[PDB]
Amino acid sequence: AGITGTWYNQLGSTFIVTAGADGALTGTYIGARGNAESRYVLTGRYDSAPATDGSGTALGWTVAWKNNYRNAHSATTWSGQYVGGAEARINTQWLLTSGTTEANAWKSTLVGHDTFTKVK
Amino acid sequence: AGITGTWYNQLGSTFIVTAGADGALTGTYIGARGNAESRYVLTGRYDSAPATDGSGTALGWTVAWKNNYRNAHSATTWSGQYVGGAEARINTQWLLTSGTTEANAWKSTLVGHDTFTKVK
């Protein structure tokens, strides 16, 4: 599908994903520090039969920011498309939601964007 | 016309706006406290010739969170539509961007939604 392998963003984070035949995405997200305390599970879904007109491959995935070493009480989802070719990329928009009390729900969700490439 | 007037959200905020014939929106946004220190200028634009087939009227406005008394070094934009009728409402999504250093840009923008009504 083209997606399986290691991807890097410009901030220095890494994600290793396996794209399954059935549409599943499984893997690990590794924040820039690169150690075991920076590793987190990711799971998602992708269009396993994309259009053939040159359109990108729709996909999305979630990381909950808890591992066995730390808990940030938040989760990020990335929603985007894979663009194949020599200079492959995954273009995404993300939502990071933090657990808050009801009174602070207004500051619960950040939005931003990330582009992932196969080379650092 | 149907938009000119006073609108209230569920959290206690108020906004007073005049919809000009030229597509201008001008007014004041007043925080829950209802204080002179809680009043901020708003300016935006709206579709002054909307469809007459039941469709809403697209509009957007911006508040920069500085007044003569305080400054929160941020700005919110609301993007949405006005829907008229007996239960008139303005349904919006908003983006709140805080001034940050380059490094902290990931937490610059919060996203949310607001529904405004003519009655509190």
Binding site: L11, G31, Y40, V63, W65, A72 | W106, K107
Partner: peptide
């Protein structure tokens, strides 16, 4: 936050 650290 771990996503940006």
């Amino acid at each position: 936050h771990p996503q940006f650290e």
